[PDB]
Structures are given as structure tokens and as C-alpha cells.
Design a protein around this ligand. Structure first.
Ligand SMILES: COc1ccc(C[C@H](C)CN)c2cc(C(=N)N)sc12
Ligand SMILES: COc1ccc(C[C@H](C)CN)c2cc(C(=N)N)sc12
Ligand SMILES: [Mg+2]
Ligand SMILES: [Mg+2]
Ligand SMILES: [Mg+2]
Ligand SMILES: [Mg+2]
Lengths: 236, 5, 236, 5
């Protein structure tokens, strides 16, 4: 590991600096180094890890979608043959995206999830596992596509089961999990009705629990509730 | 695209 | 060269795809590969090269400025000592930026400039040489700082001398050169009066030549004239 | 920062 010689605290400090500089690849490398120190991650550290990789993979996904659109148009009827280059470059970006997902899933499997006992850590990591299998599913086409989809579903489901037993309905991790599992249902599993039902039930159960919260917790929870509503508006 | 976090 | 096995035309095609996907590091790598084929670059190809590297180095410069600001505050009176990490990470970004500049300057010296005989190619490449020495100067502190500054000045000056003899005052390459040399004077050479004089004379001489242009050339030239005016407004 | 192209 290229970060093996750097102190854990220095990796965390540099991850925060990289974030301020909008250097998300560096941020992710620093946080991978911090995970590989072998100690459990605090709440803030978990979110630094997720922010870094979400920004990296988000850029890869956006690029993949641009290239995939161009490739689809290059294969339509009447289009001029432009050679293998669009497919090759889409494949290059896809392979890099898959590599980032495999890296994140590898950190979760070695050994973040198995050491995560509290709901706030375990649900967070299982949500991440579902998210990164979902990103793999977005690009999957081979014999393993159904197994990739089911790996995402299985991780999200375990996270959901824990979250419903151990967290209040307004907990922002629980809300974000439900938001993302709902999107999985809509965009990956071809289950729009399940996506809409989950988003609506999550929103309504959170609404009923807002009265228990402080001002700052209310802001955290209502932010994610608005995303659930945004998706429901898009889908209905 | 729909919102995720 | 990692691109040595790819056809020149395929590298150019992939550079254009990378641009559409906002994958500027890939774009720059493809265009470096195309340059290293050894053939001269067409006008469009020259601009693909410059767009790619400008976006890469621009991100590095923005990150360096964020980190340098944080470092300056970490050394002010009364600030809490936070260790070597801010300096180390600023140095890491700086070294990567210098490496990109050295790569671009290397392409210009081997062998783009020596084969560039027409004004539109030679002025373009000499402007680039001045630009990338200017980026080196922005971060320079050692024994070579004055020589780095003078290398930028010398390249810009040769480009200016050619541009004034061989190009009309509205030529967009000539305008952009003057814009950037003016910024060099203001921000690098501590010569604000020279910067203002150059921007004003360039603007006024272009204004007087607009009557000769088509609609599309007028739009190209007035876009850069507005940047000269923007800088003059900032500086006066 | 000032404009460059
Ligand atoms: C739920 O996400 C967070 C919770 C709390 C913090 C703050 C920390 C406790 C001290 N202020 C935090 C920082 C983040 C970042 N740098 N992106 S995410 C995040
Ligand atoms: C002066 O800059 C350009 C001039 C002409 C083109 C277009 C080409 C001739 C066919 N349309 C061009 C494309 C660019 C890019 N992809 N960023 S820069 C640039
Ligand atoms: Mg230690
Ligand atoms: Mg259910
Ligand atoms: Mg060939
Ligand atoms: Mg002069």
C-alpha cells in the first residue's frame, strides 16, 4: 500500500485537505490508506470515505453514460460506421469504474463490515455495499448480471432490516439507505411500484417522527425527505 | 436521474 | 509511450470523446500520444491539445491555491501547529503540476515548435510555452525562479513579435496571446502598468480592425476583447 | 483571478 508509511491521523488530515481542494481521487486514496490501518472508522471518518469514493465513481458514471449514449447512436440504423473507438473508450471507462467499485467492496469485505457492530456503522457500510454493487449493475451485461443485482439487493435488505429495528425513522443513514434502495428498485430491478411504495412509506414514517428532533436533526432529516419527495414527483 | 445520497 | 500502439486518428477521435465525457486527463493523454506520432498538428488538433492540458493544469492550480492559502494561515501568528501535512500535500500537488508543465514543455520542445513555420501554429505553440512557464512561475521559489520568469517572457515575446508582423490585430490567437502576456505582466512580473498598457492597446487595435471581419470572425474576436476589457476593469 | 485563455 502506497499509504502504508503515512500515519493514520495524517491520512485523515490530508483527506480533509483534499476535499477542500476538490481533489477527490487523492481524498479516496488517503481514506483507503486510513482504512488499511486496520482500526475501525469513526462516524466522521466513514463519511470522509464515502464522500471521496462517491465523487470519484460519480464522475466515472457520468462519463460512462455520455459514452454509452454516443455508442448507442453509433449503432442505430443509418449511422455512419466510426470504428471500434467508441466501444473501446466506453470499455476503458467501464473497467476503471469497475475497479473503483471492486476497491470499495474490497475495503468493506476486508474488514469494515465484519467489525461493524453498532447500527450506525453497520447500516452505513451495508448501504455502501448495496450502492457499489448497484454501480456495477448499471454497467453489467454478462452471465453474472443477475448475481450482481442480487448482491446489491441482499446488502440493502440487510441494512434495511437492521435500520428498522435499531434506528428511528428519521435517522439520516436510514433515510438515505431507503432513498437509494428505492432507486435500486426503480432503475435496476425494474420494480417501479416497489420503489414508489418504499419512498412513500419512508417519507411518511419520517414525517411522523420529526416532532422528536432538535432543530439541527430536523434539518438533517428533512433534507433527505425532500429527496424522497423529489423522486416521487419524478415517478408519478 | 433520480436522487441518491 | 502507452499510446504508441494506437492509431493517430483513433487517438484524436478518443480525445474528442474524452472531452464530451469531461475526462480531461484522458483527453490530454490521448493528445500527447497523437503529438508523439511525430506529425505536425492541424489547427483543430492544436486546440484539442491545449484544451486538454489547460483543463488538467487548471484544476491543479486551483487546488494548489487552496492548499497554499491554508498553509499561509497555518504559519500566521497565533495559529495552532498542525504538523507537516499541509506543506507536504501542497508540495505533492505542486510536484504533479510541475510534472504536467514539464510534459507540455517537453512536447513543445520535441518537436512541435521547431517544425511550426506558419504564424498560426508557431504563435500558438510559443503562447503555450509562455503559459506553461507562467504556471511554473506561479509556484517557483528557488534559485531558478528568475530564469523561469524570463523563459515565460521570452516565449511570449517571440510570439508577440511574430503575431504583430504576420497576423491581423483581431486574430484570436494574437488576442489570446496578448491577454495572457498582459496577465503575466500583472501577476508574475510585477508590472501592472505594462499589463494595462498591453491590454488597452490590444483592445483598441482590434476594435479598429473589426470592420474587416465576417459575422463569425467578429464573434470570435469580440469574445476575447471582452476578456481584455474585463481585466482592465479589474485593474483600474 | 484575471482572465486568460
Ligand atoms: C454525516 O456526515 C458528517 C457528519 C459530521 C461531520 C463533521 C465532523 C463531526 C466535525 N465537524 C462531517 C464532515 C464531513 C465531510 N468532511 N464531508 S461529512 C460529515
Ligand atoms: C480555435 O479552436 C477550434 C477551432 C475549430 C474547432 C472545430 C473543428 C474545426 C470542426 N468543428 C475546434 C474544436 C475544439 C474543441 N473540440 N474544443 S477547439 C476548436
Ligand atoms: Mg501509527
Ligand atoms: Mg419491505
Ligand atoms: Mg499509423
Ligand atoms: Mg511592446
Amino acid at each position: 500500500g502506497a499509504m502504508g508509511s503515512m500515519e493514520r491521523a495524517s491520512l485523515i488530515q490530508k483527506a480533509k485537505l483534499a476535499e477542500q481542494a476538490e481533489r477527490y481521487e487523492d481524498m479516496a486514496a488517503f481514506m483507503k490508506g486510513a482504512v488499511e490501518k486496520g482500526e475501525e472508522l469513526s462516524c466522521e471518518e466513514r463519511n470522509l470515505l464515502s464522500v471521496a469514493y462517491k465523487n470519484v465513481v460519480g464522475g466515472q458514471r457520468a462519463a460512462w453514460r455520455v459514452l454509452s449514449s454516443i455508442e448507442q447512436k453509433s449503432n442505430e440504423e443509418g449511422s455512419e460506421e466510426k470504428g471500434p473507438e467508441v466501444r473501446e473508450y466506453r470499455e476503458k471507462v467501464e473497467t476503471e469504474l469497475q475497479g473503483v467499485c471492486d476497491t470499495v467492496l474490497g475495503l468493506l469485505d476486508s474488514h469494515l463490515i465484519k467489525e461493524a457492530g453498532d447500527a450506525e456503522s453497520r447500516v452505513f457500510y451495508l448501504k455502501m455495499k448495496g450502492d457499489y454493487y448497484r454501480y456495477l449493475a448499471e454497467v453489467a451485461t454478462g452471465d453474472d448480471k443477475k448475481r450482481i443485482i442480487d448482491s446489491a439487493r441482499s446488502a440493502y435488505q440487510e441494512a434495511m432490516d437492521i435500520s428498522k429495528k435499531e434506528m428511528p425513522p428519521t435517522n439520516p443513514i436510514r433515510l438515505g439507505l431507503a432513498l437509494n434502495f428505492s432507486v435500486f428498485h426503480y432503475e435496476i430491478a425494474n420494480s417501479p411500484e416497489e420503489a414508489i411504495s418504499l419512498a412513500k412509506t419512508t417519507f411518511d414514517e419520517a414525517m411522523a417522527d420529526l416532532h422528536t428532533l432538535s432543530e439541527d436533526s430536523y434539518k438533517d432529516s428533512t433534507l433527505i425527505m425532500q429527496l424522497l419527495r423529489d423522486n416521487l414527483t419524478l415517478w408519478t | 436521474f433520480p436522487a441518491t445520497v
